Amino acid sequence: LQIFVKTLTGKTITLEVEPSDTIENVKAKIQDKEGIPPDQQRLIFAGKQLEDGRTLSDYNIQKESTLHLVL
Numbered sequence: 001l002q003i004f005v006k007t008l009t010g011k012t013i014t015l016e017v018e019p020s021d022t023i024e025n026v027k028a029k030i031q032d033k034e035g036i037p038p039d040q041q042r043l044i045f046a047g048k049q050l051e052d053g054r055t056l057s058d059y060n061i062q063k064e065s066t067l068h069l070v071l
């Protein structure tokens with residue numbers, strides 16, 4: 001599954017994940033890519049706040065979906 005994550009400057013991160021990856025797993029991938037600590041990351045998809053212990057499939061996140069890092 002390929003997804004995009006936009007940082008707070010609009011920089012695009014491209015990630016490879018599985019549909020049942022947790023948001024915690026995605027946060028670790030963003031940390032590796034950009035150095036942003038997971039506890040400072042807050043992710044939104046289609047206006048929905050994503051929780052660390054839930055999965056991408058729980059939120060209907062699909063191929064080429066874009067997630068946003070927010071304050």
Ligand SMILES: [Cl-]
Nearest residue numbers: 020021022025
């Ligand atoms: Cl896992």
